[PDB]
Amino acid sequence: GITGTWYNQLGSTFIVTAGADGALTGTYYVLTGRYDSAPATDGSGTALGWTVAWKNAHSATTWSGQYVGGAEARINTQWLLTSGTTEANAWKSTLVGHDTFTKVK
Amino acid sequence: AGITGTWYNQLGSTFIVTAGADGALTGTYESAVGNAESRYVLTGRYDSAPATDGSGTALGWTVAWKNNYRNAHSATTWSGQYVGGAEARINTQWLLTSGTTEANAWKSTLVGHDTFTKVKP
Amino acid sequence: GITGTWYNQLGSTFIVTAGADGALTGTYYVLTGRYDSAPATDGSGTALGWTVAWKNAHSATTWSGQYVGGAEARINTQWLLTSGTTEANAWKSTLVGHDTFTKVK
Amino acid sequence: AGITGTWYNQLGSTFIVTAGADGALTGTYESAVGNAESRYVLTGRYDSAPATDGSGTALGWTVAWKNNYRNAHSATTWSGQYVGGAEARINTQWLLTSGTTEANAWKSTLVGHDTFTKVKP
Amino acid sequence: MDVEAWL
Amino acid sequence: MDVEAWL
Amino acid sequence: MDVEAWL
Amino acid sequence: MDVEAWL
After folding, report:
1. Pairwise CB contact (< 8 Å): C37 & D100
2. Which residues contact residue D54 at a Cβ distance below 8 angstroms, ignoring those fewer than 6 apart?
3. What's D1-121's CATH class?
């Protein structure tokens, strides 16, 4: 259910392939991550995460979340965006937010 | 390539990370014991052309907590900066998401910080 | 624009009074916080935050975000929910998420 | 009431916090200098009946970065636990939101950790 | 936050 | 994340 | 993250 | 938060 093209709610497009053993690969820029390739059958979503380094914006975002299947499939996430900074500015180097991905724009 | 090698926290987690030439991070989480049964794949990305004025190197990685023996139905991402030198660090924030029902999805993600060092505590 | 009743997207109801000098008071349980009582006139939202201690669930949530005015007024937030735990469990004591508040259910 | 008093980070911020009997937190951020021009109001809540088995006390507070002299159009919330004893701490995570346009709202919130101690560094 | 579910 | 705005 | 404690 | 640096 994960392999394919995903759209966030702000324009962005995520093309991902989910490998049999847990790999996520694709493009957002190169993306790579991992997912639970044997999720529970108890109604739980499928845990996952991926990273894109923005190379050059000297920064990288990680998305952490879960895939939820069905007619209205979603990947529900929260993200951290860290910029390369001086040590003086390191305290303010990470932004946080959320993204909801769906199979249609 | 100062990222490549073994990194620890003061909880003493252990990660062995290889940084590839154009931005790939690969490697593993290893238990204190270091056996396959507690080993998990790590993958991520880093800025392979950071500013060379002392600024940090932006990076991130993910571990999904499934291997050939165990499955915690969860995954953690770490987001942060590598800083080199005699007291090298990877300074991070992490998000740990568990697979949950839709009713519990609101409480699926834990957050915290992690400071990694090259020196085993 | 802040004073009044707000609804998140999951049921919850937030009754708040914004005081002239930056105080937020009200109920969610008692709520208290602060807001920028002289926001910029450059299209920026109004920064704010508040806390509710859940007394007893031995926990407290902080919401951090901004008020955006107009016909479709919103308070857009992200939250941290910390539980009281043993030291052994402190590493996993804080959940993160987001909430969008609107003036209608 | 072990929460009440002055708390510091290793960035050395200074917060003076008063914990009221049934759950109120009040007080101020104070600059290194301690003058009114860099003083900001803090308000929050804490669990006034925590587990008494050594567990932490859940709490949170907010500072909006406006006073009678300055306005940084932003506010920080800290969420965490008070732990008492000889090496008392308030262990927290924070969210710092700036007022932004709708187009920049996506990048309005910074995140990090803060460890508070009673001992001025 | 789903408050009613938490409490 | 508004990627196009960030880059 | 206390990985050993989580697993 | 480095408050002194932010303000």
Report:
1. no
2. C86, C87
3. mainly beta
